[PDB]
């Protein structure tokens, strides 16, 4: 029954507040996000980085410095590792990449000594609110995992269904997206999709229904699914769109992002705690929606 | 034994359907074989099949006298040459002068090289497979087993035709919506077990109507395939678990052993044909009973009847 | 030059009408299209197939069959070979599909005896008019070529440049879309991108400018291009978007047509004459935009 | 010497009661079998599991809890280990499998510190008493080893003949089962088959005769072996049926039990002590006979 980033933010404000640890918090756009997140009751924050620069930027943007702890680390690589150390030892619920390149940030998340590393694979989950589809649309994996095979895709699916579970979708419909809705032994997408689908059928994957392969029209639309005579629980009702690799996943996200005015957020899951990872490309509202999601997950 | 919801569940039902229909014609490849001529006589007495006897006219007529078979009830074609006799029986079939082929006094390899002849043979381009049909005490349902005799190590391309050929036989028997279970060791996808991957991809093909006129659901272990009690205690649900009509084997070892076990450890009525050719092939054996010879004819006679 | 479908259709009305052959014309939705196409003044058409099942539908829909030619062929397959023939034998300027399934219709166009074979690969181009962008956007290949290699991708590009020429873009900006804008041996798409950019440079791909690999956003948006310090004739001004394969392709196509109100049309090129291959999936006005696209490419040549 | 499960059970009662160590005793079917084993004096038992849950089940079935020892361990994974520790350290003579997935039970039996680990490959031995045949047919491996090759098959055979020795078959007749009774380079199982038959001939595999390949029928039936004119000490009189892979052997196994009034039982060997890997779908009598086998073997 949860269909909008507004009902998402509302539910966040309804639960106990959560703490985010900013990795190199000298980022002005990130702190702008931490602030409007703190005042409206979405999330708290610990700022890890250069005390003097952080405090400078905070005055400029009218952000009470006395609202937040600030662990002073001038070194950028150490500032990142300390934000993750804060979360791995449960003094914080989430990490937000700050003024660090996504590579060094992701090494720290992955640190074998103090990181958030797990048994499962790490995966990105993007979420979208469209003018044209009343339910929420989740895309995994659009960012981190390049050419994942079955071993990875199982985990990529479990990680995304955890996120739909948090948003309140009890039993979400997972469509492995391919070019065609049909087993085709020259397209290994569809073979992975058949196998995930048997896996759901037998309870090796739980808390969802998986039915692929499915082209993107068959997964989105009832009219299209009927046009090509595809039946079952997922055609025209897909909550989760499992992308076959990064190339397809990235082109889909950016088509939505650059051709639509769709409210969207994204988080990294699979780790021991949710990770927020924005770019100067993401808007303040995306950054909001992103923290907003990372919160809901961490309270589940 | 709980009661099956099919129309046809036994070989007496199978043979009475054969008899409810226009007589089909069998080309016997090398007819100078008494157990096959015994079989072919009784086929004619009881209205199951007409036969053309292809081979050495002199010995066919001798053996006919020995078994009280009335040679006026049957066209004979004189080919004293064995290799050429098997080929002729096959050519008669491919040129629609008889509906099915039977092996007589020929070695299996020769007969088969004959059926697969490039010029006069029975090739269709899809793969040829053996379907075995059994009537067990313990299940009120015909069981179909594929491939138990021909395909040795089929991969997905072959299993798809082995499945479609299965469904054609079931349809001919009278099962319009058969239930097919790709048998493996387990009921779960295991990367270290190719059978199960193959089972998954056939199952999605069934679901999207790439395979038609059936429900394919696997992998399933044999116990979940037939027993509802086993399906139940193992939490396995769906249209095939406990109700499997067709048992697709992962290979000839699995098929052969299943089959040899049923024959030497039960008294289950059984019959077998080869299909996927342009016409059904009875490939009977010195080991099969007179009853098994007859059932085999009756199966072909139905595949051809469609 | 041209920046809208309204402009494509006006400019198509400028020229002399072009005949379309409908392979199995007994199709309500395609005949509603062929009809609208004649009243507006876009195309005349030969309606090949069952003369009786065609008139029943003609009457139903309110098109006097007198304004059209009819070639009676009651066989599905023969009507489609005959459709393709009326183009191949110079009597019509493009083929569009009807009741024939897609596979049979594609055997019919690529027929060796009377077909439209050119020896160069047959590619599908899709064309988009979006609110967020003023230039027409071209997506190849989205429909036909599944996993093209460098040699099939040269042709894919060359067909698309031919189409963009016919719209009035005399130098199309071609971006080999890829996950990243940097070269990556692990991503075969980036390799083919580099190799393709090189052939543009040496004037081995003529009449256009190819620069890849480019993430879609670098190719779409001047702002995205700038913020990642990627420059050149293409980045942020891309006209043709070269999809690395059909999975990436199919998904960018359906994401546009299901989440936006962008007008679009599609033709298959790399053939002697344009081919329109339309579907229940396609709207009525995208069937039109598609017919109009073929007529512009047929007319320019 | 011993030709029936009644005889197996007479020799078990004949000698001193041994103890099952049930891995997680909160299982009605397992306790129903452990109860009938105590009654008939086939074996004692230590039940390792959730004490409270154990007793209400012992109440539900007529099990007098005073006739068993209960080691209280609520944690399923730890209950599986304690069961094995009791065997490894000689307080019991077998493990049996309760409310655990097979993966968690086998890993516990294969434990490095406290396990029943050994030199030998673990192999399953099934054992049948059929109507049509006067001797016990033993099947190996129908359950544990998936795609064994020559090295594992040698251990599967040795393990196999060791069990036959305890039944009183002094010189058992091992048939490597294949589709055909002749060599064929395109059927790997026949290569392995003559491989193994040479090792018998050379005396490398001792205490048995090994002849193959043999089709199942040649091995079973004097008639079938006579008809295809196959001779030697094994054709027509095979005691042990060495299967080519789990798929083949599971299908013989499940065909035989769901299609016949055969009685059967099975244990895992190779380990330092017999194991009883029970199934959800095993009957009461199979679980019983299976305990009986484990007891008979632990008497050797």
Taking residue D13's Cβ as centre, other Cβ atoms within 10 Å add up to 13
CB-nearest to D132 from B221, B260, B264 is: B264
Nearest-CB residue to B261 (from D187, D252, D280): D252
How does DSSP classify residue A159? H
- Number of domains present in the structure of chain B: 1
Helix axes C51-61, C28-40, angle to 10 degrees: 60
Helix (H, G, I), strand (E, B) or coil at D209: strand
CB contact under 8 A, B227 and D130: no
Task: Measure the CA–CA gap between C298 and D173, rounded to whole angstroms.
Answer: 81
3-state class of B3 per DSSP?
strand
d(CA C153, CA C169): 20
Q: How far apart are the first and last CA of chain B?
A: 31
Give the residue among A256, A230, A231, A227 at the shortest CA–CA distance from A243. A256
The pair of three-digit structure tokens given for residue A176, joined into one six-digit string: 């492995």
Structure tokens at B94: 């491919």
Q: What are φ and ψ of residue C295, in 5° steps?
A: -65, -40
With contact defined as beta carbons under 8 Å apart, do B79 and B105 qualify? Answer: no
Label each residue of C122-162 as H, E or C.
CEEEEEEECCCCCCCEEEECCCCCCCCCHHHHHHHHHHHHH
Distances (CA, A) of C172 to A254, C152, C165, C234: 22, 19, 8, 9
Task: Write the CB contacts of C55 (distance below 8 Å, at least 6 apart in sequence).
Answer: C65
State the sign of the Cα–Cα–Cα–Cα dihedral B187, B193, B199, B201: positive
Q: Are D258 and B206 in contact (CB under 8 A)?
A: no
Rounded CA Rg of chain D? 19
Rounded to the nearest angstrom, the minimum Cα separation between A183 and chain B is 6
Instruction: Report the b/e string of A209-227 with b at 16+ CB within 10 A.
Output: bbbbbbbbbbbbbeebbee
Q: Among A186, A245, A259, select the one facing C132 at the smallest CB separation.
A: A259
A187 touches chain C (CB under 8 A): yes
Do B279 and B123 form a contact (C-beta atoms < 8 A)? no
> Sheet holding D209-210: strands in order across?
D69-72, D44-49, D19-22, D94-96, D275-276, D263-269, D123-129, D137-140, D240-242, D173-176, D209-210
Sheet holding A137-140, edge to edge: A69-72, A43-49, A18-22, A94-96, A275-276, A263-269, A123-129, A137-140, A240-242, A173-176, A209-210
Instruction: Evaluate the CA torsion angle C103, C108, C109, C113 in order and state its sign.
Output: positive
Q: Do A102 and A28 form a contact (C-beta atoms < 8 A)? A: no
| Residue D32 Cα distances to C41, C57, D16, D287, angstroms | 86, 74, 22, 9
Length, in residues, of chain B:
306
Asked if B232 and B212 count as a contact pair (C-beta separation under 8 A), the reply is no
Residue B256, token pair as written in the block? 């052969």
State the best of A255, A256, A281 to mutate against chain C, taking most chain C CBs within 10 Å: A255
Q: Note down the domain range covering D161.
A: 1-300
Radius of gyration of chain A (CA): 19
Q: How far apart are CA C39 and CA C291, in angstroms?
A: 14
Calculate helix-pair angle for D284-298, D5-14, nearest 10 degrees: 50
Selection from B299, B304, B286 nearest residue B43 by Cα: B299
Nearest CA to D293 among D109, D18, D23? D18
D247 φ/ψ angles, rounded to the nearest 5 degrees: -70, -55
Structure tokens at C223: 């702002």
Inform me whether the C-beta atom of residue A201 falls under 8 Å from chain B C-beta atoms: yes
Could C187 and A258 be called an inter-chain contact, meaning their C-beta atoms sit closer than 8 Å? Answer: no
Helix (H) or strand (E) holding B26: strand B24-28
**Neighboring chains of A (3 or more beta-carbon pairs < 8 A):** B, C
Dig out the tokens for A132 from the structure: 């044209």
Residues whose CB is less than 8 angstroms from the CB of residue C255 and which lie 6 or more positions away in sequence, other chains included:
A216, A252, A255, A256, A259
Please give the structure tokens belonging to residue C168.
């009035």
Q: What phi and psi values does residue A86 have, to the nearest 5 degrees?
A: -65, -35
Contact between B188 and A204 using a beta-carbon 8 Å cutoff: yes
Helix (H, G, I), strand (E, B) or coil at A282: coil
Alpha helix segments (H runs only) across chain A: 5-14, 28-39, 51-60, 76-88, 102-109, 150-167, 188-202, 216-220, 222-227, 246-259, 284-298
Nearest CA in chain A to B187: A202
Mark whether C and B touch (3+ CB pairs within 8 Å): no
Hey, what are B173's tokens? 């028997």
Q: Which residue from A265, A41, A42 is spatially nearest to A143, judged by alpha carbons?
A: A265
Q: Report CA-CA distances (Å) from D40 to B88, D63, D127.
A: 69, 13, 21
Report the side by side order of strands in the sheet with C18-22: C69-72, C43-49, C18-22, C94-96, C275-276, C263-269, C123-129, C137-140, C240-242, C173-176, C209-210
The CB density around residue C254, as the number of other CB atoms within 10 Å, is 23
**Who contacts C24 (Cβ-Cβ below 8 Å, separation ≥6)?**
C48, C49, C50, C76, C79, C80, C83, C97, C98, C99, C100
CA-based R_g, chain B, Å: 20
Helices and strands per DSSP (H, E), number in chain C: 11, 11
In chain C, the N- to C-terminal Cα span, in Å, equals: 17
**Method of determination?**
X-ray
Q: What is the DSSP letter of A86?
A: H
**What stretch of H or E contains D70?**
strand D69-72
Q: In whole angstroms, what is the distance from residue D175 CA to residue D239 CA?
A: 8
Quote the strand ranges of B29-98, DSSP E: 49-55, 75-78
Helix (H, G, I), strand (E, B) or coil at D260: coil
Chains D and B touch (3+ CB pairs under 8 A): yes
CB distance B77 to B88 below 8 Å: yes
Closest of B72, B70, B61, B66 to residue B32, by C-alpha:
B61
DSSP 8-state symbol, D192: H
- Residue D143 in contact with residue D277, Cβ under 8 Å? yes
Contact C116, C84 (CB under 8 A): yes
Q: Tell which of D226, D254, D260 to mutate to test the B interface (max B CBs under 10 Å).
A: D254
CA pair distance C227, C238, nearest whole angstrom: 16
What residues in C contact A258, CB-CB < 8 Å? Answer: 132, 216-217, 220-221, 224
Using CA atoms, how far apart are residues D77 and D57, in angstroms rounded to an integer? 20
State the DSSP code for C207. S
Length of chain A: 300
* Resolution rounded to one decimal, in angstroms: 2.9
CA neighbor of C275 nearest in space, from C283, C286, C267: C267
Q: Which two tokens stand for residue B210?
A: 């790439």
What spatial distance separates the first Cα and last Cα of chain D, rounded to whole Å? 16
Cα B287–B291–B294 angle (5° rounding)? Answer: 105
Instruction: Please say whether the beta carbons of D238 and D164 come within 8 A.
Output: no
B77 half-sphere exposure, CB direction, 13 A CA radius: 23
Instruction: Please judge whether C217 and A257 are an interchain contact, meaning their C-beta atoms are less than 8 angstroms apart.
Output: yes
The answer to whether D212 and D125 are in contact (CB under 8 A) is no
Could you give the CA distance from residue B185 to residue B65 in angstroms, rounded to a whole number? Answer: 52
Q: What is the C-alpha to C-alpha distance for residues A177 and D28, in angstroms, rounded to an integer? A: 44
HSE toward the beta carbon, residue D210, CA cutoff 13 A: 27
Helix (H) or strand (E) holding C176: strand C173-176
Q: By the 8 A CB rule, do A134 and A278 touch?
A: no
DSSP 3-state assignment of D245?
coil
* Strand partners for C170: none
Q: What is the DSSP string of B96-159?
A: TSSSEEE--SS-HHHHHHHHT-TTTS---SSPPEEEEEEE-SS-BS-EEEESSSS-SS--HHHH
Whose structure tokens read 């049957």? B74
Which residues in chain A touch residue B207, judged by CB atoms under 8 angstroms apart?
Answer: 211, 232
How far does B219 lie from chain A, in Å, by closest CA?
8
Quick check: helix, strand or coil at residue B272?
A: strand
Whether the CB-CB separation of B271 and B300 falls below 8 Å is answered with no
Q: How long a stretch of residues is chain C?
A: 301
Query: Which residue matches tokens 């769901």?
Result: D258
According to DSSP, the residues that pair with D19 across neighbouring strands are D44
CB burial class (10 A; 0-12, 13-18, 19+) of residue C135? Answer: middle
Q: DSSP secondary-structure letter at C264?
A: E
User: For A60, how many CA atoms within 13 A lie in the half-sphere containing its CB?
Assistant: 12
| Residue D133, phi then psi, degrees to nearest 5 | -130, 140
* N- to C-terminal Cα separation, chain A: 18
Helix axes A51-60, A28-39, angle to 10 degrees: 60
Q: Does B236 touch chain D (CB under 8 A)?
A: no
Give the helix/strand (H/E) hosting D72. strand D69-72
The tokens of C113 are what? Answer: 């005896």
């Amino acid at each position: 029954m949860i269909k909008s980033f507004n009902e998402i933010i509302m539910k966040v404000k309804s639960k106990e507040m959560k703490k985010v640890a900013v990795a190199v918090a000298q980022d002005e756009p990130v702190l702008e996000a931490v602030r409007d997140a703190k005042k409206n009751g979405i999330a708290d924050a610990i700022l890890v980085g250069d005390h003097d620069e952080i405090v400078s930027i905070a005055l400029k943007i009218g952000m009470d410095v006395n609202d937040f702890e600030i662990v002073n680390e001038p070194n950028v690589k150490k500032a990142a590792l300390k934000a993750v150390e804060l979360v791995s030892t449960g003094k914080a619920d989430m990490v937000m990449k700050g003024l660090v390149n996504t590579a060094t940030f992701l090494r720290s998340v992955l640190n074998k000594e103090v990181g958030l590393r797990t048994g499962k694979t790490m995966s990105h989950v993007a979420v979208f609110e469209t003018e044209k589809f009343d339910r929420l649309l989740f895309l995994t994996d659009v960012a981190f995992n390049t050419y994942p095979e079955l071993k990875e895709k199982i985990d990529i699916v479990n990680n995304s269904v955890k996120v739909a579970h948090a948003i309140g979708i009890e039993n979400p419909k997972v469509a492995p997206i391919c070019a065609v809705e049909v087993i085709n032994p020259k397209m290994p997408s569809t073979l992975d999709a058949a196998m995930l689908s048997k896996m759901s059928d037998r309870g090796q994957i739980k808390g969802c229904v998986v039915d692929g392969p499915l082209a993107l029209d068959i997964a989105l639309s009832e009219e299209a699914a009927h046009h090509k005579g595809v039946t079952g629980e997922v055609a025209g009702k897909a909550d989760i769109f499992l992308m076959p690799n990064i190339e397809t996943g990235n082109v889909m996200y950016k088509t939505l992002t650059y051709t639509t005015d769709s409210k969207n957020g994204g988080i990294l899951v699979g780790t021991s705690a949710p990770v927020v990872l924005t770019s100067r490309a993401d808007s303040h509202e995306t950054k909001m929606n992103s923290i907003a999601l990372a919160a809901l997950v961490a309270g589940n």
